Design a protein around this ligand. Structure first.
Ligand SMILES: CC(C)CCC[C@@H](C)[C@H]1CC[C@H]2[C@@H]3CC=C4C[C@@H](OC(=O)CCC(=O)O)CC[C@]4(C)[C@H]3CC[C@]12C
Ligand SMILES: CC(C)CCC[C@@H](C)[C@H]1CC[C@H]2[C@@H]3CC=C4C[C@@H](OC(=O)CCC(=O)O)CC[C@]4(C)[C@H]3CC[C@]12C
Ligand SMILES: CC(C)CCC[C@@H](C)[C@H]1CC[C@H]2[C@@H]3CC=C4C[C@@H](OC(=O)CCC(=O)O)CC[C@]4(C)[C@H]3CC[C@]12C
Ligand SMILES: CC(C)CCC[C@@H](C)[C@H]1CC[C@H]2[C@@H]3CC=C4C[C@@H](OC(=O)CCC(=O)O)CC[C@]4(C)[C@H]3CC[C@]12C
Ligand SMILES: CC(C)CCC[C@@H](C)[C@H]1CC[C@H]2[C@@H]3CC=C4C[C@@H](OC(=O)CCC(=O)O)CC[C@]4(C)[C@H]3CC[C@]12C
Ligand SMILES: CC(C)CCC[C@@H](C)[C@H]1CC[C@H]2[C@@H]3CC=C4C[C@@H](OC(=O)CCC(=O)O)CC[C@]4(C)[C@H]3CC[C@]12C
Lengths: 388, 388, 388
């Protein structure tokens, strides 16, 4: 709690002082001298309301665009943010020094000559705001480069289009798209592949090349063990899927019967779905467990999670197919619980510095626990179009 | 017609008057007094052209961004639009009152002091324009939240990334992505599922739990009726697909033969594809009807629509595979006719008010005739990246 | 090289002169007259720093948004770019003429009256910059229209959402999405289809319609030759895929064994993957060639490309599944070599003028060597949402 307040005060007090700087500039001359005032006329009154409106617009824009919580942590310093911060710092301190030196040191600088200066601040500071969207959001709008992300474990391949962005920013975009695009990582397939491959190790340069070529030729004429076992596994998966579908349909029929029975007990008082899920889960529990075992998905789907999903479906009145399809096949990472995914162990590996922008032919790696994503960057070819 | 003009006049006259307000401000002093003019010099001439250029830029921007037809109707009031409208209203009326009170009430306010005021308007109003993109478009650029949309009927699941948006805006985005992303809703599958489930109803707490567990265990050892009938249906669908492919290939061969025959009749005079479609449709009509019956897609595909698609393919000279794949499997909603989809019966259900912004863990429902879409909102986890 | 420099000088000198125009405007009066200077005071000093900051912001924005290489060539003139260029040209020349006529022709226009003019330029020019994003990027942000792109050869269908854009811009967006979205074009399937269809040609109005209907009815009762041969082809493809998977697993086991053996030879000195790939390729070469022959993918995948991919996987330590899936099925165009795709022969065909904006119901064609993409444009329906 203390750290949050300490971080918030730094960003709040500086913003408050830079926003009230025009107010101080327009309220200091009246309080410094009283009998030396020159006739202001009307230009000051006309400029005051325009300055107030510009300040209100700046406040609204700052709240809309930049009053938000940080989403990700950058391994290195952010070039654009640091540039904007130092630009704002100099923009403020130079004006403060000018006001303190060229104005407060002499009995001069009439009020009518200060208000036009004051509106010169909000006119310029807003321009800095106009720069902020340029470096952050408007720079990446154009689809310049193409990023291909391939997983090292299961080989899932995805394609995205990005603009002129840093390596770290591109990696963060790839990571945020990974959760909602890539299939959940399953180490069971990796363990099965390792078990299959370990048999060759357990069993055990022109001449060596000839010998290995002859061995490969002999293997090509051997029995195709993989195909028949894959077909049998697919048949078993289909049979268990059909059994699970039938069980879920019967469970939903029982749910409808229970709701109908509870309707007569009390009108206008819907029952809580929790007890219905409690009573209905054992009916399909065996089928669901068998399907998870045959699909190697028991680790991700927990009993409490299944009950919560069933209760959510009961509240929404979803069809049995919607409930079935969640456990049917593996999907996005965000579907499962929060503890399933880790957003802290991610690392970036690249020969080039991450501060540099995207270039054609550069390749980087996003490492994480037991798995890595290789990202290839390519340049969009020069498309030439002609009217026939 | 009258309603359209009435709505257009309100948005046109106000824009015209707010755009011509600087013109009135710079043209009223010359017409009010003539012999009281002060020497303007050159600053007024320099400011006039800058004001004209700023007005031209504002006109171009207003035409580009905001001169467009409304796309969707908001069930509640739009906060950002109302805020912008009231801000513009006060920005105009306060300046009008200031001009009418502090200037027109006395023989003062020399011309050189008014032009600098006039350019203060277009400088500020454009800033309001700069605010309009901030609240409407620039606010949703950052991918803050993730929305998962699941259909209640068939369980189709999709994932999207949105920014800081209202519940109604997120629902509208989900709806507009539904047409081009989700598969067309097919009630035939629902009717088949209901017919299958009705058999159990027609046939008909620890002890009850034990009895239902024993019944489920006995059912698990029963015959798997679903798998074999699904396999037979898939085989029939594949056979009818092959027959339809052969029929379409023969029809395209006949189309090519007819075109070749018509070539000799008259050079440079291509035949209208309508009669070719008329003559060719009966050849593949039986196969197409059988495929639609076996795929439960006869309702969506009409005979006139099939003829129009065939004529379009003849004009474009598409391969038979392109024609086949449209009727092969169900696709997006926008493929079929306009009357197929309804954009009026949509409703929004959410415990929280739709005016509030997106928050983690909130869930809402988009209802429509016989089907609902459940949308879950999640927050992107804090991704921490480190350089190894 | 000469052409690049000639093109760069035109865009560089004009930018330099328009950026230094305020500097010339503020530095010419001091060098023209010396003894006629009026007391400047302090407003000039306050405006100078604001002008410098605005110039710096303009330079940063110009570098960020517009200092980039051209991506595509427009067959016709670009309306927005031409409008911006002519607007800038007039904005510069009119001010230059005004400065040369109304200032340099008389011993007038005191310095204090010029600086406020000078800041009037950077205030307006930046606004022109604010217009540039409006016409180019901010105009297409709103998802107005939907574009459906269907290939003429294989019938691949994709859907995209675009804004208020010209026909040329929409075609360019479709083309840039085609590489990363559509499957690579394979003429082998077209040749097979043509060979299958040529048999009917080689073998060879109410009465004609009856005869063709009877022929179609007789054909519907004939043998389904396509289904059985497709099933046999699928079985052969699956068997060869399993054999290739086994061969790749054995090759990766050999790679791991070679790496382990080389580890003892020298610590901290990793071997180059080129020789390992050279020694390992013959082991899986026969299986890979057989799979390419059965999948008609031998043309795209070359031996050098396979060796490079194997070396890349060895460097990244990818699983055999990742290596297998690249050659498993045809994917995006960008995966293969640069020479595979052509971005010069693209042509645009449309009855309406390409300079006009997108409208509902308009259809255009993107032609290229042996294949065309038909794009249909539709308007998003008016969605009406109500709170229950
Ligand atoms: C008058 C005002 C606008 C001056 C503002 C200061 C900038 C000129 C400074 C502030 C932050 C600096 C950046 C901070 C960090 C880096 C990372 C740094 O990366 C490396 O040293 C490794 C990559 C390499 O080898 O080049 C390269 C310079 C750069 C972009 C700096 C470039 C110069 C910047 C933009
Ligand atoms: C007479 C006065 C007005 C001249 C002012 C010079 C500026 C136009 C220069 C000086 C320092 C430059 C900056 C120095 C370092 C950086 C970091 C640099 O970062 C990178 O290379 C990584 C980001 C990317 O990929 O663009 C990008 C250019 C930038 C912002 C430069 C932009 C142009 C700046 C502001
Ligand atoms: C000096 C100028 C800029 C003043 C402009 C007026 C605004 C302060 C007003 C105009 C429209 C108002 C909004 C109109 C409608 C609503 C919906 C309203 O929703 C509810 O009452 C239900 C949700 C809840 O329980 O909070 C909440 C306030 C809000 C956002 C209002 C907040 C205050 C707003 C932005
Ligand atoms: C001394 C003067 C300059 C103070 C001016 C105060 C403003 C900075 C305040 C006063 C009224 C506020 C508004 C009152 C109500 C609304 C509606 C409110 O709407 C919502 O909560 C839903 C939209 C969303 O999710 O952000 C968002 C904040 C906003 C625009 C507020 C933004 C900040 C405003 C303009
Ligand atoms: C005071 C300043 C802002 C004037 C700037 C000049 C514009 C009014 C000009 C410059 C470029 C012109 C465009 C250049 C090319 C074309 C394509 C041209 O296309 C055709 O002639 C075929 C389509 C048809 O049949 O209308 C239509 C006019 C247009 C958009 C022109 C419209 C008028 C433009 C925008
Ligand atoms: C008293 C003074 C300030 C009046 C100035 C009139 C402008 C508001 C007009 C005059 C010329 C017009 C332009 C003439 C031609 C074109 C090209 C035209 O191009 C198209 O139709 C294709 C692009 C699209 O789909 O919008 C779009 C409108 C535009 C920019 C027009 C925008 C509005 C302009 C600048």
């Amino acid at each position: 709690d203390c750290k949050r307040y300490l971080g918030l005060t730094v960003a709040s007090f500086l913003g408050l002082l830079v926003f009230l700087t025009p107010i101080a500039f327009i309220l200091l001359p009246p309080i410094l001298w009283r009998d030396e005032l020159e006739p202001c006329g009307t230009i000051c009154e006309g400029l005051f309301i325009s300055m107030a409106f510009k300040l209100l617009i700046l406040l609204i824009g700052t709240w809309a665009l930049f009053f938000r919580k940080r989403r990700a942590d950058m391994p290195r310093v952010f070039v654009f943010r640091a540039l904007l911060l130092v630009l704002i710092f100099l923009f403020v301190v130079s004006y403060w020094l000018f006001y303190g030196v060229r104005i407060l040191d002499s009995r001069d600088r009439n009020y009518q000559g200060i208000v036009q200066y004051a509106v010169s601040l909000v006119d310029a500071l807003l321009f800095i705001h106009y720069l902020a969207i340029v470096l952050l959001e408007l720079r990446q709008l154009q689809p310049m480069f193409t990023l291909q992300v391939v997983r090292s474990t299961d080989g899932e391949s995805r394609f995205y289009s990005l603009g002129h962005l840093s390596i770290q920013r591109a990696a963060l975009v790839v990571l945020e798209n990974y959760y909602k695009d890539f299939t959940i990582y399953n180490p069971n397939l990796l363990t099965a592949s390792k078990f299959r491959a370990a048999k060759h190790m357990a069993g055990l340069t022109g001449q060596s090349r000839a010998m290995i070529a002859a061995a490969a030729r002999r293997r090509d004429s051997s029995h195709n063990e993989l195909y028949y076992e894959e077909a049998e596994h697919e048949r078993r998966v289909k049979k268990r899927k059909a059994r699970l579908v039938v069980a879920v349909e019967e469970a939903f029929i029982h749910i409808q019967r229970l709701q109908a029975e509870e309707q007569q007990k009390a009108p206008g008082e819907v029952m809580d779905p929790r007890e219905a899920a409690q009573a209905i889960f054992p009916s399909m529990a065996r089928a669901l467990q068998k399907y998870l075992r045959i699909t190697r998905q028991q680790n991700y789907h927990s009993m409490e999670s299944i009950l919560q999903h069933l209760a959510f479906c009961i509240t929404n009145g979803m069809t049995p197919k919607a409930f079935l399809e969640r456990y049917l096949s593996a999907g996005p990472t965000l579907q499962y619980d929060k503890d399933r995914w880790l957003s802290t162990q991610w690392r970036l590996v690249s020969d080039e510095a991450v501060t540099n922008g995207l270039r054609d032919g550069i390749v980087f790696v996003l490492k994480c626990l037991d798995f890595s994503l290789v990202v290839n960057v390519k340049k969009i070819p020069f498309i030439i179009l002609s009217e026939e």
